[PDB]
């Protein structure tokens with residue numbers, strides 16, 4: 001179990017989850033500022049107002065990155081911190097923060113990967129319809145161009161979008177995430193525009209002629225039927241397409257998955273598209289980022305979804321604090337499936353990790369054995385994928401540090417680093433952090 005010498009071992013975060021400084025130095029309001037300040041939306045009424053205060057503490061966080069020995073740091077940039085209204089004026093202090101951050105990363109020999117959109121849409125753009133407005137895709141493209149030009153020669157790994165499935169469906173169908181809408185047709189229109197905006201950014205990446213590589217990051221959850229019933233098998237297949245193929249087929253094949261597209265259209269009516277959209281959505285990219293956490297086991301059951309599909313709770317199997325099944329085999333399955341059915345391009349696991357009930361000792365120790373076991377077990381499946389020909393180039397752990405976990409607030413801890421919010425926001429390396437350092441150095445698990 002030795003990994004390639006040049007394998008990119010990293011850790012990942014996102015802007016709203018760690019930065020804080022929510023209305024400081026010219027920053028505009030995001031849909032997540034608004035959502036978290038709306039009653040009943042976040043566990044315990046938590047907000048990302050301060051979070052980990054990374055906006056002020058970034059220099060200390062980079063020292064901690066150095067202690068862990070990560071080769072690359074994946075982070076997202078806040079669109080409303082840079083263009084407060086989404087379009088219009090640039091906020092120079094906002095841009096300046098990311099410039100300092102990138103400079104500091106490069107001086108520590110840490111390779112930056114930027115995610116352009118990790119869910120924090122400017123509220124001014126939401127007031128004009130947000131992702132159901134085709135113009136939002138244009139403004140995203142303009143924001144991308146601004147960042148490409150600013151970091152030309154400085155950042156060589158770029159991700160347009162993080163988890164467009166979640167943005168579309170949790171944000172607009174089920175209303176669990178900002179902006180809180182609950183309309184399945186809206187979600188489908190939003191998915192289309194996220195994909196369009198991705199392709200528009202790729203076109204701009206090519207034109208600007210930056211050194212480096214661009215991709216998109218998709219959450220992928222492989223589905224398994226509960227039993228050999230073909231109704232079970234069909235239901236699993238449909239749920240699987242609903243999360244996975246719905247984004248993988250347009251990016252790589254230039255079409256929505258046919259059976260699912262037909263079912264949506266017949267029952268809901270068509271969402272609005274223009275001729276040529278699929279050509280834009282399917283522009284050639286340099287890599288695919290995969291975010292993996294768990295699988296779903298699926299059976300056929302009466303439900304208020306078009307699939308009559310139920311996700312089965314696997315009560316008999318180890319799970320995390322999220323209640324998610326621990327199923328490392330799924331990581332192998334999904335990497336192999338992508339490489340066979342969709343693309344021969346390089347792959348990166350841009351997220352994988354776990355929440356456990358972390359206990360900070362009086363001396364600042366966190367003995368997170370369960371996270372070490374979780375990470376090592378998934379590392380081994382990644383190795384197995386490499387052994388079998390999958391061009392896996394790197395692996396970023398979610399997350400570098402504990403943070404604002406959206407609707408769960410601070411109650412869920414995914415970090416390699418413990419953040420003691422109550423006591424000056426001090427950081428403590430968990431045992432998994434020093435265990436990870438050993439993995440990176442030896443290239444072995």
Ligand SMILES: OC[C@H]1O[C@@H](S[C@H]2[C@H](O)[C@@H](O)[C@H](O)O[C@@H]2CO)[C@H](O)[C@@H](O)[C@@H]1O
Nearest residue numbers: 014162163166291351405406407408412
């Ligand atoms: O979306 C499901 C569930 O995910 C967890 S973890 C989450 C990270 O917070 C997000 O930044 C990353 O890109 O994706 C993973 C999976 O979506 C999140 O804490 C929780 O609120 C959310 O409901």
Ligand SMILES: [Cs+]
Nearest residue numbers: 259262263266
């Ligand atoms: Cs049909």
